[PDB]
């Protein structure tokens, strides 16, 4: 060889650097911005409670997107406003462009008094436009679940702007639904996608009431390290409890059992 060098490669697994950065996510919860419409209004106003937003941020990753389902109701005399009352974490795994949720929507006695309001997901980069993956996901959920009204369900993106998180809420259009339910291209400029597939909706952060989380009854929600155990057909029940952070030990047991070997 150049037998005057001799270098040993030393592993530098990428999840470790990501696990260090995920431990500083809490700093972003003090600087949380909501884009104001300028589109402008579309029907309902969504009020998101800060407590679950902050927790949603703290349990996330900066590269792999995570998602929760939105549930809530209208203030008593006020049909115009949708207060988000619960975020549901279901078994999932993600990449930087999409999340993979089960086909089964949440089912629990506690949600049957509320209505489904859509979903929220983290995004690595802030983007001026709703992802086509997002439009496709939202439209295929609508096709398989009549309970999701096109005029009542939204996508909230929570984008990792530097030192911050910026929230923006979108709804599908009729034309968006029809395009996204038939769409099978995963990439970023799939044929037929266009910006008239969604509108922006007004969203407000509030401190006057608290939301709560539901999580799976047996597993946790994070399968990004146990992907093989995750399946679109998987079934899950729910419990009233708070979600564990992304790199909690229960989400990556093989890191703990294969290090102990030997």
């Amino acid at each position: 060889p150049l037998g005057s060098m001799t270098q040993t490669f030393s592993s530098k697994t990428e999840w470790r650097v990501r696990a260090i950065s995920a431990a500083n996510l809490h700093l972003r919860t003090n600087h949380i911005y909501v884009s104001s419409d300028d589109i402008k209004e579309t029907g309902y106003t969504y009020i998101l409670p800060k407590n679950v937003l902050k927790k949603f941020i703290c349990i996330s990753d900066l590269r792999a997107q995570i998602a929760g389902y939105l549930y809530g109701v209208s203030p008593p005399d006020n049909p115009q406003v949708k207060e988000i009352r619960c975020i549901v974490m279901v078994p999932q795994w993600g990449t930087h462009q999409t999340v993979h949720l089960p086909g089964q929507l949440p089912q629990h006695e506690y949600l049957k008094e509320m209505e489904p309001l859509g979903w929220i997901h983290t995004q690595p980069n802030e983007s001026p436009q709703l992802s086509p993956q997002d439009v496709t996901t939202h439209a295929k959920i609508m096709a398989d679940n009549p309970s999701w009204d096109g005029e009542k369900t939204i996508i909230i993106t929570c984008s990792f702007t530097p030192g911050s998180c910026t929230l923006t809420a979108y709804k599908l259009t009729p034309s968006g639904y029809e395009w996204g339910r038939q769409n099978t291209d995963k990439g970023n400029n799939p044929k037929g996608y266009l910006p008239s597939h969604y509108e922006r909706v007004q969203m407000l952060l509030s401190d006057r009431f608290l939301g709560f989380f539901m999580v799976p009854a047996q597993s946790s929600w994070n399968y990004n390290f146990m992907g093989v155990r995750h399946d679109p057909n998987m079934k899950y029940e729910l419990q009233l409890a708070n979600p564990k952070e992304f790199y909690h030990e229960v989400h990556r047991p093989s890191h703990f059992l294969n290090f102990a070997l030997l």
Binding site: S10, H26, F212, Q239, L240, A241, F256, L257, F259
Partner: protein, 1725 residues
């Protein structure tokens, strides 16, 4: 003091530790010589000659020891030479001792002599030992030594029934050991950490003797621990005056006389120094000092020296070789055995065919381990703690019988086994220290112990110790082993940590205290005697000859370090120290002060596991660890795969410590030798360090981090991560099948109710599905359920029910199992509430109830969470969500009744001159509240409610009503209820003066004796009573005219319906309402209360119209109340009390410098402690005596009357204290002095806050919890007691304001604001208390069917409240089917229990009727549970024996306290006592009262505690006795009833039936009526007939006494008894036979019974009994009181025809020897 100067403590440190060598030179014994050799030098020191033989001393035969001590020397004839010189000083004095002697000279037996002298102090009359009286602490420096001394001393002292034990492991679960152990053997550090906490209830005040073994450890880096211990013990001897004997056992080294000074040893009495001439076997020494500095040649020079030395002994002498690793043990043993092979020299070791050569061939093939099997046939062996215990037992046994020739081992063998060898070789003196991060020299103690093992005591004429070291170490080892290495102090560096320990304890509260404390240190003594060695000039010592300045500087320096690191707050001006929680955690967890500063800086609630491992890795305990280049490749391979990422580079030692911990948890093997020693040191420390982090974050409320840190604690302890199957924690399971289970990633908890079969299948090892099933259900599991109980709209009461759902097994769980209960908020962010929870093995199957408060707010948050998490089991948790979706909040409360700005009301408004004389010179006008309610109370008959803060003159308002009653009815009757006996007494004397003295009515105070009380309400116009006393009477209202004829019923402090004894108060009020509705002649009711938020509910319940309810809130108190609630951080109660001591003083100067102050403290002990503390602070304010406002002269006609010397001292300085232990006369004097203004402060215990006849300008409430000794737990003050203490700050005629400061734990501050600034909500608890009242109402026929019971409930407050706060009562709707269902459930459950206890009958599941049992229970006011057991146990041949047994077993005596300190006292009492029990458990209250009762019948005078306990036992005994009489009677048993009736007499007069009837007479010696039996008198009647002048001449006693015996003789019953069988002729079988009895009283009832030893005044009661004595048959019985004459009628049925002779009994219930017996016959036809 000033000017101080700040020192560099590090510069003063002796860096080399025990290797410090103060002596410049070393003289050797004559005959020593040096040999130059092969680049090493040898020094030889010949063996000494034993010194003989002293002027006058021979060995002492055991014969001549004291007799009690000889048992401890069984198996010896004569003490050795040293024990003989020490036996007098050790066994015949209490003198502190210092014994200096060479190793093995016999110091152990000298300690035993000291122990035996202490043991002797507690031999009682039967020869056993009062093992409750004392503890002995034996401090041994090494763990292996501790264990050997536990067995050695255990064996020697067994014949004394004494427990010797080591302190095993974790102690927040296992201080059981210590109340059971008399001789505790432990290391210095263990005893430090234990006495650093104290808290209590400790047992360290039982410590009478401390033995400091190997006290030359003072010279070690560990030496400061001994200084801390000794200084703490001695200084404590001063402040508590309890002496403790100290025994020092030392090597023979210089400065031993300074050691003696430090131990308070008198050098003329306690100091003994035996030079090396007294070694048991003389020692020939060789020191080999290598000069070769090159590692590898030096290394083989070492083995060359070893081999050459071994050969000088091969075959001749057994060789013990010492090395300092588990690993070099084998490597050296093999290196030696191998180069003998190379040079063919193994034949010298073994005998070509010995008895031994096969004894080790035999045992080697059967020995089972690799290293040993290889060497043992060659005469070689190894020994270390990394191998077996029976292989080590093998090695020790084979060596013992002279079978092994060469044994390589380490220091542990030297310390832990008694194993001498003729020849000892110490191969090298260098050892790896993880603490210092490098190689160092062995400590002195180790070297001494090893070479001590040379020379076997019986076999050898001399021993030969060979020490191989580096040549520059020769002088050091020569000095250590030839009496010349001086013992120095190592404590300047440890000074900050040990000073903080004293501050945390409260022993040191300022820089002066610390200068005093430092004066007790060994450091101080050495500074005085060798200043230069300690950094002090001789010029400076001498301008400062006590080193006063120097100590202040040191203390100054240390305090500044503690303050900079936030352990202490240090005021340089005053020198005061303030404790903190950080400080307390550092002391209690044994953490250095730089570490807890790092923890304070870095810990944040958002911390990740990544950052948590980093924080741990930065602990200063690891500050000497480095990353070596030879470690970096193995560290980086592990850093690559660590499950917890590590931010920092591997070049930082932080990263290496981090990786070592994770590697430990994952149980990795590592190849570097240093790295594994570092791992061991990092992780042994991790345990207490991580438990410190946990306590820090738990008490800060940081939910997420609390979870992480508690889990890391468990991962460290259990050596596994969460992700592993929790069943690995069952170590008795093949780590096989667990890996099986982990392979299948399926959740652990659906193994639970799955069966034995499907377990084996899912795992694919059905081979053992039942075993996995077994362990699955051993795993600890709790089920949680909750009853939510809204208090207000912002406070929620939670009752948590814990149900164990697992099978217990002491093999796995032990005696208990600990948990943390954690109430967390919506976001699992904040711990709203937490407590420790201990599941005891005896309760492993019961439900446990927990109650606590949490705040709530609006709009209601979605849920809280309750987690119950194991303190030790990993993956062992239950989280119960607590959703509020259905929480029904009570309505917010109404506004108060306005206080109207009315013209103040003159006393003239009473328009009655006699009435005005009750008030007119106390004040001119009534306050605003009395002005507003006057018209309604005085000019109306409406039921009225008045709610206002304590101190608003509410009871005057009820006086208004009494006065209106007297106008309407000249002989009208008032019943006044107050909930507290002390309040009833206060009101009694004030109302006695007002209405009897100044108005000529009758004011009476109900006693609780039934017909005494009944006479009182027949005559009194004002009847004052507590609730129970009125309940017993008011139950009988249908038969008792003088109950329904009540004009006025006043209940005071009625808000106490909501407190612990509220239900009886609710019931009797509910009854007065029900009665008034029946009789239709309304009974007026007035209710007085503290401010209530739900006042309208009370008022509606009591029939008060809206205009006649004055619901005032606290802001209207006539004397404005300035209320201050100060929160305190510290969670540990002792330390928190300390943190409050100074603020108590400052509160006085800030809020009431001149005006009177009451300090309420949690306990009797604390009253004294705080009075002295207040004073000590006053003296350092140089304001001594400024609370004394009378002369130091007017004080002392008051003072000399007192018994307590401390109360006199503090009173002399202006400060009294009050507690229930002081004579009633002591309390009155303190109160007079306080109310006269003579003394300005009185410190009162909390239990006195109802019976206090004094008021103050400022009330300080110093903490708000008290220790309940039954439940071994701290209990919050009831809000009612707090309101009552706050009310003592109210001087209407003296102050413009009242002030109160409440100091409480910070977690309680919000609660006190919510419930003191606002009016109080109250609930009923009658629904938990129904049985005894339902039973009474069925007896009285108020309740006759289930519907009646439902209606009855509608009269109660419980029932009004059920619709206002439904959830509190477990109702979910207020609908009328809702509460009519709920009412019926309460009814069905109550009646079913009563019917099953046979108190009532139920017919048609509808109609209820009383049974005799129930009638008895109701009549005597006895728990139906008690009467049920009374019905099981009493039989036809019950005697005085069982009557006392059965009676003690009543539920009324369940709460008689067990005091740990009375255990042997009750044991010895059960031997002083006539009737012996059956296998008595002395932890049982019913056994306890059984003996208190026998003590009382025997007139044994006991402690003040046991006599107050006796007095409450006695307050209940008559009714239980009379109940028994009633049961036995209704069952027809004659002899046991007659016995029960004499029991009544026995208890009343305190005697036995066998006793002399003259024992009842006043002033009667029990000496002289065997002098009275000597001259013809046996009864009382004989004394009265007896001439007068001779009467004064019998008794040998005084004349005032002669009038006392006269008054007794003149009330002693003398009754004439007639009886006639009416129509005695025409009596036919099965017919009525009526016997007529006449009782005429000679005398009067000239007053009540005379019985000075019985606590209540009694009236004479009587039984008339018709029995068949031959048959044991009671046929007729009647109870009667007697005046002059009474006639009694007894009926029964005639039996078959006879010939039937009966016996008539007339029995007293109060006096002995008054009983009469007349036989009579009836001829029946």
């Amino acid at each position: 003091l000033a000017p101080r100067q700040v020192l560099d403590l590090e510069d003063l440190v002796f860096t080399q530790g025990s290797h410090f060598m103060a002596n410049k030179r070393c003289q050797l014994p004559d005959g020593s010589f040096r040999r130059q050799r092969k680049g090493y030098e040898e020094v030889h020191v010949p063996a000494l000659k034993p010194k003989p033989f002293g002027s006058e001393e021979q060995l002492l035969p055991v014969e001549k020891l004291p007799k009690y001590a000889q048992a401890g020397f069984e198996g010896f004839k004569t003490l050795n030479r040293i024990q003989s010189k020490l036996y007098r000083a050790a066994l015949e004095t209490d003198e502190n001792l210092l014994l200096c002697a060479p190793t093995g000279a016999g110091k152990t037996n000298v300690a035993l002599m000291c122990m035996l002298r202490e043991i002797g102090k507690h031999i009682n009359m039967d020869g056993t030992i009062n093992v409750d009286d004392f503890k002995i602490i034996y401090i041994a420096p090494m763990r292996s030594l501790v264990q050997e001394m536990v067995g050695s001393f255990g064996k020697r002292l067994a014949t004394y029934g004494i427990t010797v034990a080591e302190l095993t492991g974790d102690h927040q679960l296992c201080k059981e050991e210590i109340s059971a152990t008399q001789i505790i053997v432990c290391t210095p550090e263990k005893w430090d950490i234990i006495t650093r906490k104290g808290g209590e209830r400790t047992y360290t005040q039982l410590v009478r003797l401390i033995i400091l073994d190997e006290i030359h450890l003072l010279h070690d880096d560990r030496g400061p621990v001994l200084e801390a211990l000794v200084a703490r013990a001695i200084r404590n001897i001063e402040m508590t005056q309890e002496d403790v004997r100290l025994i020092g056992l030392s090597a023979t080294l210089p400065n031993y006389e300074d050691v003696a000074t430090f131990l308070r040893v008198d050098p003329a009495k306690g100091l003994f120094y035996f030079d090396n001439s007294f070694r048991p076997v003389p020692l020939e020494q060789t020191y080999v000092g290598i000069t070769e500095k090159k590692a590898i040649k030096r290394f083989q020079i070492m083995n060359e020296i070893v081999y050459e030395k071994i050969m000088e002994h091969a075959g001749k002498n057994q060789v013990l070789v010492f090395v300092h690793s588990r690993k070099e043990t084998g490597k050296t043993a093999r290196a030696i055995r191998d180069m003998c092979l190379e040079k063919d020299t193994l034949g010298l070791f073994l005998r070509e065919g010995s008895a031994s050569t096969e004894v080790l061939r035999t045992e080697a093939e059967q020995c089972k381990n690799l290293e040993l099997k290889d060497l043992l046939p060659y005469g070689f062996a190894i020994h270390h703690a990394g191998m077996t215990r029976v292989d080590r037992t093998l090695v020790e046994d084979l060596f013992a019988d002279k079978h092994i020739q060469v044994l390589v081992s380490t220091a542990t063998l030297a310390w832990g086994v008694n194993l001498p060898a003729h020849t000892v070789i110490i191969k090298g003196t260098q050892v790896y220290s993880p603490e210092k991060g490098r190689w160092t020299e062995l400590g002195a103690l180790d070297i001494l112990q090893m070479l001590g093992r040379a020379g076997r005591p019986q076999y050898d004429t001399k021993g030969e110790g060979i020490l191989i070291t580096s040549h520059g170490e020769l002088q050091y080892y020569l000095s250590l082993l030839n009496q010349q290495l001086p013992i120095e102090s190592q404590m300047v560096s440890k000074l900050p940590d040990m000073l903080n320990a004293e501050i945390v304890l409260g022993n040191v509260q300022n820089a002066k205290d610390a200068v005093n404390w430092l004066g007790y240190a060994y450091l101080y003594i050495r500074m005085l005697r060798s200043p230069t060695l300690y950094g002090i000039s001789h010029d400076d010592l001498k301008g400062d000859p006590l080193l006063d300045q120097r100590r202040l500087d040191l203390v100054h320096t240390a305090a500044l370090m503690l303050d900079k690191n936030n352990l202490v707050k240090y005021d340089k001006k005053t020198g005061n120290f303030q404790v903190t929680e950080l400080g307390r955690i550092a002391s209690h967890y044994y953490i250095t002060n730089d570490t807890v500063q790092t923890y304070n800086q870095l810990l944040k609630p958002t911390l990740s596991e990544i950052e948590l491992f980093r924080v741990f890795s930065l602990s200063s305990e690891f500050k000497n660890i480095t990353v070596r280049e030879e470690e970096k490749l193995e560290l980086q391979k592990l850093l690559e795969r660590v499950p917890i990422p590590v931010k920092e580079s591997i070049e930082e030692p932080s990263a290496k410590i981090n990786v070592l911990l994770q590697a430990f948890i994952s149980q990795l093997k590592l190849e570097g030798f240093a790295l594994m020693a570092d791992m061991v040191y990092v992780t042994q420390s991790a345990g207490r360090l991580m438990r410190a982090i946990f306590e820090i974050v738990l008490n800060r409320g940081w939910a997420q981090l609390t979870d992480k840190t508690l889990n890391l604690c468990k991962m460290i302890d259990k050596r596994m991560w969460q992700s592993m199957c929790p069943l690995r924690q069952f170590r008795k399971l093949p780590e096989e099948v667990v890996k099986k289970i982990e392979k299948k990633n399926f959740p652990f908890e659906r193994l639970y109710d799955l069966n034995h079969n499907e377990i084996g299948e899912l795992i694919r090892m059905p081979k053992m599905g039942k075993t996995i099933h077994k362990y699955v259900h051993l795993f600890p599991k709790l089920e949680l359920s909750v009853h939510l109980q809204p208090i207000t709209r912002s406070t929620l009461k939670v009752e948590l029910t814990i149900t164990p759902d697992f099978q217990w097994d002491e093999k796995v769980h032990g005696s208990s199992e600990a948990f943390w209960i954690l109430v967390e908020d919506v976001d699992s962010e904040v711990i709203l509430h937490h407590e420790y929870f201990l599941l005891k093995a005896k309760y492993a199957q019961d439900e446990h109830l927990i109650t606590f408060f949490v705040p709530v707010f609006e709009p209601l948050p979605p849920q809280y969470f309750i987690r119950v998490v194991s303190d030790r089991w990993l993956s062992c948790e239950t989280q119960l969500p607590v959703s509020f979706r259905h929480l029904i909040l009570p309505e917010k409360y109404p506004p108060p009744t306005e206080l109207l700005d009315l013209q103040p009301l003159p006393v003239s408004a009473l328009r009655n001159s006699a009435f005005e004389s009750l008030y007119q010179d106390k004040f001119p006008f009534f306050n605003p509240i009395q002005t507003q309610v006057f018209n309604t109370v005085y000019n109306s008959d409406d039921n009225v409610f008045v709610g206002a803060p304590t101190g608003s003159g509410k009871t005057i308002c009820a006086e208004f009503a009494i006065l209106r009653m007297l106008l309407q009815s000249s002989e009208g009757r008032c019943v006044y209820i107050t909930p507290m006996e002390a309040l009833a007494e206060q009101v009694y004397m004030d109302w006695y003066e007002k209405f009897q003295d100044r108005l000529n009515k009758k004011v009476v105070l109900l006693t609780g004796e039934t017909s005494t009380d009944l006479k009182l309400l027949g005559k009194g116009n004002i009847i004052i009573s507590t609730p129970e006393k009125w309940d017993i009477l008011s139950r009988r209202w249908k038969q008792r005219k003088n109950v329904q004829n009540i004009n006025l019923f006043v209940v005071d402090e009625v808000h106490l319906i909501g407190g612990e004894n509220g239900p009886v108060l609710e019931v009797i009020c509910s009854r007065m309402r029900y009665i008034s509705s029946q009789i239709e002649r309304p009974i007026r009711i007035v209710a007085l209360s503290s401010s209530l938020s739900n006042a309208k509910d009370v008022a509606h319940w009591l029939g008060c119209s809206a205009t006649s309810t004055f619901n005032f809130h606290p802001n209207v108190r006539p004397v404005p109340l300035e209320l201050h609630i100060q929160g305190f951080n510290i969670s540990h109660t002792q330390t928190r009390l300390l943190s409050m001591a100074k603020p108590v003083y400052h509160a006085i100067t800030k809020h009431s410098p001149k005006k009177p102050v009451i300090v309420f403290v949690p306990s009797r002990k604390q009253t004294r402690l705080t009075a002295i503390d207040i004073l000590t602070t006053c003296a350092a304010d140089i304001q001594r005596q400024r609370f004394l406002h009378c002369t130091e002269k007017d004080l002392i006609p008051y003072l000399e009357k007192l018994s307590d010397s401390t109360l006199k001292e503090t009173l002399l300085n202006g400060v009294g204290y009050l507690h229930e232990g002081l004579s009633p006369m002591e309390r009155r004097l303190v109160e007079q002095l306080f109310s006269s203004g003579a003394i300005q402060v009185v410190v009162a215990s909390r239990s006195l806050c109802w019976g206090m006849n004094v008021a103050a300008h400022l009330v300080i409430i110093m903490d708000t919890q008290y220790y309940n000794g039954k439940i071994h737990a701290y209990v919050d003050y009831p809000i009612y007691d707090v309101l009552q203490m706050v009310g003592h700050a109210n001087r209407p005629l003296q102050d413009d304001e009242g002030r109160c400061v409440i100091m409480c734990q910070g977690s309680k501050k919000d609660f006190f604001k919510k419930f003191l600034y606002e009016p109080l909500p109250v609930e009923s608890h009658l629904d938990h208390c129904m049985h005894d009242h339902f039973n009474a109402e069925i007896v009285t026929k108020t309740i006759e069917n289930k519907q009646d019971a439902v209606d009855y409930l509608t009269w109660t407050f419980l029932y009004r409240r059920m619709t206002q706060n439904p959830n509190y009562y477990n109702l979910q709707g207020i609908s009328h089917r809702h509460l009519s269902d709920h009412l019926s459930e309460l009814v069905e459950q109550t009646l079913s229990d009563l019917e099953q206890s046979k108190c009532i009958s139920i017919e048609d599941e509808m109609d209820v009727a009383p049974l005799n049992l129930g009638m008895i229970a109701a009549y005597y006011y006895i728990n139906y549970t008690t009467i049920e057991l009374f019905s099981m146990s009493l039989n036809a041949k019950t005697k005085v024996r069982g009557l006392i047994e059965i009676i003690s077993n009543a539920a009324e005596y369940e709460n008689i306290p067990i005091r740990h300190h009375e255990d042997n006292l009750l044991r010895q009492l059960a031997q002083k006592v006539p009737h012996k029990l059956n296998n008595p458990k002395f932890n049982d209250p019913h056994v306890k009262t059984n003996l208190l009762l026998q003590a009382h019948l025997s007139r044994m005078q006991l402690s003040a505690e046991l006599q107050s306990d006796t007095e409450e036992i006695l307050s209940k005994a008559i009714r239980l006795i009379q109940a028994c009489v009633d049961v036995l009677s209704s069952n027809g048993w004659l002899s046991p009833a007659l016995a029960a009736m004499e029991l009544a007499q026995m208890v009343t007069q305190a005697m036995w039936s066998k006793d002399s009837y003259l024992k009842q007479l006043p002033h009667f010696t029990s000496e002289h009526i065997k002098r009275c039996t000597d001259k013809g008198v046996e009864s009382v009647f004989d004394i009265m007939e007896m001439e007068d002048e001779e009467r004064n001449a019998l008794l040998q006693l005084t004349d005032s006494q002669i009038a006392d015996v006269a008054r007794f003789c003149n009330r002693y019953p003398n009754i004439e008894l007639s009886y006639e069988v009416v129509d005695k002729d025409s009596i036919r079988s099965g017919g009525p036979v009526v016997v007529l009895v006449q009782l005429e009283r000679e005398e009067e009832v000239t007053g009540p019974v005379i019985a000075p030893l019985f606590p209540q005044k009694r009236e004479e009661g009587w039984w008339v009994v018709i029995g068949d004595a031959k048959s044991n048959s009671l046929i007729s019985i009647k109870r009667l009181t007697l005046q002059q004459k009474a006639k009694v009628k007894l009926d029964f049925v005639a039996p078959a025809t006879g010939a039937h002779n009966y016996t008539l009994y007339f029995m007293s219930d109060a006096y002995m020897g008054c009983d009469q017996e007349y036989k009579f016959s009836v001829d029946v036809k």
